[PDB]
Amino acid sequence: KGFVDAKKVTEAVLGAIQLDANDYRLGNTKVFFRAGVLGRLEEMRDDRL
Amino acid sequence: MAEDPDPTEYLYISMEQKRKDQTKPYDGKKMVWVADEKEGYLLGLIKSTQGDICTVDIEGQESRQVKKDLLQQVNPPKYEKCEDMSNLTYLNDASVLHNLKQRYYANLIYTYSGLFCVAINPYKRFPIYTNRTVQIYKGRRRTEVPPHLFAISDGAYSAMLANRENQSMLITGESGAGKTENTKKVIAYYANVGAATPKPGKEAPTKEKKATLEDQVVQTNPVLEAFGNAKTVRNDNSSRFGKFIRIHFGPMGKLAGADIETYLLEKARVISQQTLERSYHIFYQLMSGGIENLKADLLLSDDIYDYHFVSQGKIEIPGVDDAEELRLTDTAFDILGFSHEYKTDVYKITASCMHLGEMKFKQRPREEQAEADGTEEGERVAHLLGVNAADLYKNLVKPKIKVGNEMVTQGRNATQVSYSVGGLAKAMFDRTFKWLVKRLNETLDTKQKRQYFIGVLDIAGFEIFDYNGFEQLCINFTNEKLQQFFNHHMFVLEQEEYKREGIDWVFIDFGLDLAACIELIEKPMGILSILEEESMFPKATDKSFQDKLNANHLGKSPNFVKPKPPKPGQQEAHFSIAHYAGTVPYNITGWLEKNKDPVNDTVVDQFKKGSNKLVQEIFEDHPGLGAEEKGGGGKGGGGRKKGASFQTVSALYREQLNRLMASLHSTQPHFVRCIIPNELKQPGVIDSGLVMHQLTCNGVLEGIRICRKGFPNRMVYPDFKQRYTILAASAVP
Amino acid sequence: KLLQEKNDLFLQLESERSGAGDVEERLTKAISMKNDLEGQVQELQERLS
Amino acid sequence: KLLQEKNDLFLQLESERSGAGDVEERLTKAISMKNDLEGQVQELQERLS
């Protein structure tokens, strides 16, 4: 419980899943995905799934 | 007791009136009514008459020379502060004016003028809806039942159950003439007398002692008022919709069910309110009453003033909270039969509409294809719908553009997107309240009893402001027809009913008619106007609309007030119609888009593929709500009705107009003519300038001239013959 | 409820059936002014030529 | 049997709604046709002028 700068909220969630902010690049509105990164996120869920 | 019968307490008027001799030496015989500024009409004396000219002084003693035909003849206080209006003789204006002003001010709002009463909305919570008032009145012998709305409803219930013909209950008013508050008291008679309410505990104060149908049908009204009501400049509690209650009655006496239709909803105000108006009530309740847990899952800010679709600021309502009123209504869902999920689910679909307008689009001039600066604003929407996040924030700016029938992607430019997002809010709220009123009716549909009824024409509006648009016009378009049904029912259908019943009556009329301006039958209404025959063509505008009204009505139709020049060259386009309560200014520039309704396809189609059950239901055909784009062949909708474009609501408001009005003139009417005492929203204040317009204009002087001999009590000849019979054991054996 | 729903539908059967007739009058407007318009297309085309 | 009167009145109703369904398409087709015939007329007069 503590939603604020959505940029900062997302760094924390993605920091818990250990990705530095250069494979997924941030800007303002959107996140850029380098190869693997989005479909590694999909895979991470879909390990337990 | 001196032509009048015997009195009771504050509920009645002061009806043990004296006959105090002082009044009498004035009946001799050359006093008259004269125009003043301060009171309105006043008392004058003919001193000397110069043929067709007259020198008449006044209460103020100012000797004035007058022309004959103004001199309204004096009608003495034999008829001061009676319960019913009837007995007043010389029905020229002053005689009625005087008499109502000093009724309201003497605590009596609701005053009898036969069946169709006069009510001057008090604006206060009066302790006269107590169960004392509603325990004595268990089908009472009407003298103990004096000029309040319970008797009116008693007299409806008491004719109807016996004589088997369907009924209506129609309160008219102008802006904030407390309509809803009145109908709650029609229902509060019904909810505490004729039904199975176990009364023998005798509690005059808080009863709350069954039936459950009664406790339920009541709660649907706060529920309706939290969602659908908001605030205006005149009106704190402004029902931003218009409803019809069909009060159903079974075989034996007591209640059977209730069918509420709903006409319009003011979804346009959701982007920004104008001046001091408040957002849809439900919203603020959910904000203040919510606790630490719920607050997270629903995605409320802790701080206030964030909520971007609440304009001007947080404005208060006088003398109510927002926060405890949440806890009332939530439990009024519990009490209806909502489930522990669906509680959170209706609020989930409600609060996103408070959120959404947080989405800040910003100019990135390399193209002008703006995208919005965040996620929080979008996510607190996205989760509460449980729609695909990866769709929303891409596909809102980049949708699959249907070109004819094939498909090309496009990025959208800055303002189209901001506007479509504001569109997404007005799409959510309109669809949900319409989902809600039916899903409310479902719990209260006549469950294996009978659909025999009273229809209550509780259309909340006729609200006058500088801004009147299309929105105001489609509300005002019924309220007009209601004043037309007044003429059609105070002269006409009152006595047309006496005629059907073959009573001792005489057909008499005076002559009041709107139908030389306003369209009444569904097809005249579906010819009105440069909107269905032309909304589909790229060159038509709210400018050509005004010009085709100005071609098709002006000069020859004497009822249409024309603009005071916001039309030569540069228009906002204004015109006016001669509606009884007020010549009103409308604006036309915009209407087209309020009669086409333009959003984004790809996102609301992907929202159809949503989750959270209720959030889902709000979307498709099968009953007929959204499924909202692609191409129904070229008609103008929709689904029913008509084909595709998103909306066209003015034609759908033909579709229900036919079915409602057909019923209304068949179902015998009860009326209450509610009027407002002041502009300033204040309790107890009455103004004479306003009252002088209003009592002329509501059909009141004319509407005593017949309805004086008109009957306010109406029941059945077999019972009444058989309940009496042996009283005349001398005469009938 | 069914002895009533007999008369209920019958009432609504007046409702949609007048709605058929009136909208067909507005369709008769089309069916009529069509002839005049075709007449106008005849007299137009013949004279410009 | 009471319901069979409700059955027939409803079958009937639906067929008058579907007759009016025809009339929807028919009507709007006639309205769209009017507006083209207008565009045939107005201009052809204007080309005389």
Q: What DSSP string runs through B580-606?
A: TT-------TTHHHHTT----HHHHHH
Catalytic residue among B238, B446, B476, B535: B238
Give kind and range of the element (H or E) at residue B42.
strand B41-50
| Chain centre to alpha carbon of residue B261 | 13
Helix B342-355 / helix B282-289 crossing angle, nearest 10 deg: 110
Rounded Cα gap, residues B246 and B441, in angstroms: 10
Peptide bond into B641 cis (omega under 30): yes
Residue B433 token pair: 């309240």
Minimum-distance CB partner of C15 among B451, B527, B659? B659
This structure was determined by cryo-EM
* Nearest CB to C4 within list B450, B526, B666: B450
What type of residue sits at position B692?
Answer: M
Question: Using the beta-carbon criterion (under 8 Å), do D24 and B642 form an inter-chain contact?
Answer: yes
Interface test with C, best of D13, D18, D32, D36 (most C CBs within 10 A): D13
- Known catalytic residue: B180? yes
Q: What is the interface size between B and D, counted as CB pairs within 8 Å?
A: 11
What residue of B is the nearest CA neighbor of D36? B537
* CB B577 within 8 Å of CB B561: yes
The rounded distance, in Å, linking the Cα atoms of B436 and B94 is: 48
Judge whether B163 counts as a catalytic residue: no
Q: In sequence order, what are the beta bridge partners of A33? A: A24
Residue of B nearest to D26 (CA): B635
SS3 B198: coil
Neighbours of D48 (CB within 10 A): 9
**Is B239 assigned a catalytic role?**
yes
Peptide bond into B638 cis (omega under 30): yes
* Residue B28 amino acid letter: G
Nearest to B452 among C4, C15, C18 (CB): C4
Residue B442 is among the residues annotated as catalytic for this protein: no
**Residue B496, helix vs strand vs coil:** helix
Distance CA B635, CA C23 (A): 14
HSE of B344 in the Cβ direction (CA atoms, 13 Å)? 15
Please name the member of B533, B537, B635 whose beta carbon is closest to the beta carbon of D24.
Answer: B635
Q: How many CA atoms lie within 13 Å of A22's alpha carbon, on the beta-carbon side? A: 1
User: Percentage helix, strand, coil, to 5, in chain B?
Assistant: 35, 15, 50
Q: Which of B221, B235, B479, B648 is catalytic?
A: B235
Beta strands in B383-499 (DSSP E): 400-403, 406-409, 452-456
**With an 8 Å Cβ cutoff, is C19 touching chain B?**
yes
Give the pair of three-digit tokens for residue A1: 């419980």
The span from the CA of B304 to the CA of B323, in Å, is: 13
Chain B positions in Cβ-Cβ contact with residue A11 (cut-off 8 Å): none
- Sign, Cα dihedral of B496, B498, B504, B508: negative
Residues B248, B451: contact at Cβ < 8 Å? yes
Contact partners of A by the rule of 3+ C-beta pairs under 8 A?
B
B405 touches chain C (CB under 8 A): no
DSSP H/E element including B56: strand B53-56
- Is residue B463 within 8 A of residue B581, CB to CB? The reply is no
Q: Is B523 on the interface with C (CB under 8 A)?
A: yes
**Across the interface, do D16 and C12 touch by the CB < 8 Å criterion?**
no
In this structure, are residues B461 and B475 in contact, taking their beta carbons and an 8 Å threshold? Answer: yes
Please tell me if residue D22 touches chain B, with a CB cutoff of 8 Å. Answer: no
Residues of C with CB under 8 A from a CB of D: 2-3, 5-6, 9-10, 12-13, 16-17, 19-20, 23-24, 26-27, 30-31, 33-34, 37-38, 40-41, 44-45, 47-48
B12 and B24 Cβ atoms separated by less than 8 Å? no
Annotated catalytic, B617? no
How far apart are the CA of D9 and the nearest CA of chain C, in angstroms? Answer: 7
Quote the minimal CA–CA distance from A19 to chain B in Å. Answer: 19
Chain CA centroid to CA B240, Å: 9
Q: Residue B523 and residue C5: Cβ atoms within 8 Å? A: no
Q: Do D32 and B635 touch (CB under 8 A)?
A: no
Give me the resolution in angstroms, 1 decimal.
20.0
Only one residue has tokens 């439990």, namely B331
For residues B300 and B285, give the distance between their C-alpha atoms in angstroms, rounded to a whole number: 12
Put simply, whether B635 touches C (Cβ < 8 Å) is no
| Rounded Cα distance, B300 and B589, in Å | 37
**Residue B259, min C-alpha distance to chain A (Å):** 43
Q: What residue type is B365 in one-letter code? A: P
C22: which residues sit within 8 A by CB, 6+ positions away?
B521, B522, B523
What is the least distance, in Å, from the CA of A33 to any CA of chain B?
13
B448: chain C residues, CB-CB within 8 Å = 1
C22 CA: distance to closest CA in chain D (Å): 11
CA of A48, closest CA in chain B: separation in Å? Answer: 20
Which one of A3, A9, A29 has the shortest CB-CB distance to B371? A29
Query: Which phi and psi (to 5°) does residue B52 adopt?
Result: -90, -15
Rg (CA), chain A: 12
* Closest CA of chain D from B452, distance in Å: 17
B490 near B673, Cβ under 8 Å? Answer: no
Contact B92, B33 (CB under 8 A): yes
* Secondary structure (3-state) at B348: helix
Report the alpha-carbon distance of residue B230 to residue B273 in Å, rounded: 10
Flag if D41 and C45 touch (Cβ within 8 Å): no
User: CB within 8 A of B243, min separation 6: which ones?
Assistant: B224, B260, B261, B262, B263, B437, B458, B459, B460
Give the residue from B166, B248, B450 with the most C CB atoms within 10 Å of its CB, the best one to mutate.
B450
Helix axes B342-355, B323-334, angle to 10 degrees: 140
Q: Is B522 on the interface with C (CB under 8 A)?
A: yes
Helices assigned H by DSSP within B228-309? 282-289, 294-297
Burial class (CB in 10 A: 0-12, 13-18, 19+), B273: buried
**Number of residue pairs across A and B with CB atoms under 8 Å?**
24
Residue B721 Cα distances to B160, B252, B503, B724, B732, angstroms? 17, 21, 16, 5, 12
Question: Which residues of chain D have a Cβ shorter than 8 Å from any chain C Cβ?
Answer: 2-3, 5-6, 9-10, 12-13, 16-17, 19-20, 23, 26-27, 30-31, 33-34, 37-38, 40-41, 44-45, 47-48
Q: Is B228 a catalytic residue?
A: no
Q: How far apart are CA B425 and CA B384, in angstroms?
A: 13
> Which strand (E) or helix (H) includes residue B376?
helix B376-385
Residue whose C-alpha is closest to residue B223's, from B66, B366, B48, B350: B350
Work out the minimum CA distance from B451 to partner chain C, whole angstroms.
7
CA distances from residue B411 to A25, B371, B401, C44 in whole angstroms, order as listed: 21, 10, 10, 47
